[PDB]
């Protein structure tokens, strides 16, 4: 269509608008780029591996659970 063009390792994607913030991979394209439909038009973004958190590691610090949850899951 030529409305929009964006270069990528696996080629160039036409009809999608690149975004500068990451989301979860909905429609994989390649080279870390995934496409999704969000408020609406098709957008291209770099897939996010997940939330980033750093454990407060210390020489004399330990964390011990105070409660529990017996979660049951299904496997096929």
């Amino acid at each position: 269509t030529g409305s929009n063009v964006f270069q990528t390792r696996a080629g160039c994607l036409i009809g999608a608008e690149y975004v500068n913030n990451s989301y979860e991979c909905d429609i994989p394209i390649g080279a870390g780029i995934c496409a999704s439909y969000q408020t609406q038009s098709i957008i291209a973004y770099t897939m996010s591996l997940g939330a980033e958190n750093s454990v407060a590691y210390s020489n004399n610090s330990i964390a011990i659970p105070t409660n529990f949850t017996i979660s049951v899951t299904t496997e096929i």
Binding site: A56, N59, N60, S61, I62, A63, I64, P65, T66, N67, F68, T69, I70, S71, V72, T73, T74, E75, I76
Partner: protein, 227 residues
């Protein structure tokens, strides 16, 4: 016990709701069904392939061609369609090998999880596995993996050993936590602090060798019985 039973019942209900609502929870069997259906469909469709002949209908070519000339076309069709069926058989063999691997994995999981308590990290689901329940499926087995997931973690200061009477004390089956200003012994996976005593600690070596050792008192259950 009551809280654990309530949690188990609620999570079982949650599995029921998720199975009812989830669109593609059982994709690992629909995929096999679709693969078999597609294999059959492509085997049947390739029947109509011309294979370079004048027509794909044997009765038509036998009528519009002489036997000397129709023989070559019949050979073309027979060779092509035998090749098609051989390719289908090879794909079926590969799929059967994959299904055999899956069935071996399923049997191993059944044995380890349902008939026992596997100590493997992720073989019976995420978390510390307790038990699993098998459920039949049209072309597979569905496992409901019950696991123990710790929650509500609290940070505490700990020391590798406790120095008392010039000797180093280590936890027999617990962990040292200070609560800020009072040392206790707690199990690794649950916060059940207990007073430090000779019963739950063992002595080995002096306090100098151990790195990070801290000073605290160890209670002797027989100490009060002086008389």
């Amino acid at each position: 016990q009551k809280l654990i039973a309530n949690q188990f019942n609620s999570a079982i209900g949650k599995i029921q709701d998720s199975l009812s609502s989830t669109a593609s929870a059982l994709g690992k069997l629909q995929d096999v069904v679709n693969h078999n259906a597609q294999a059959l469909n492509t085997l049947v469709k390739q029947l109509s392939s011309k294979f370079g002949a004048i027509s794909s209908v044997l009765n038509d070519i036998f009528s519009r061609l002489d036997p000397p000339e129709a023989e070559v076309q019949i050979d073309r069709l027979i060779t092509g369609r035998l090749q098609s069926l051989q390719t289908y058989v090879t794909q079926q063999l590969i799929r059967a090998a994959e299904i055999r691997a899956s069935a071996n994995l399923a049997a191993t999981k059944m044995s380890e999880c349902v008939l026992g308590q596997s100590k493997r990290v992720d073989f019976c689901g995420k978390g510390y596995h307790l038990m699993s329940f098998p459920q039949s499926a049209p072309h597979g087995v569905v496992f409901l993996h019950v696991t123990y997931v710790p929650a509500q973690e609290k940070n505490f200061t700990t020391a590798p050993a406790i120095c008392h009477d010039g000797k180093a004390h280590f936890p027999r089956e617990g962990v040292f936590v200070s609560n800020g200003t009072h040392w206790f012994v707690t199990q690794r996976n649950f916060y059940e602090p207990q007073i430090i005593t000779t019963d739950n600690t063992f002595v080995s070596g002096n306090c100098d060798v151990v790195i990070g050792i801290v000073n605290n008192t160890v209670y002797d259950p027989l100490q009060p019985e002086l008389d």
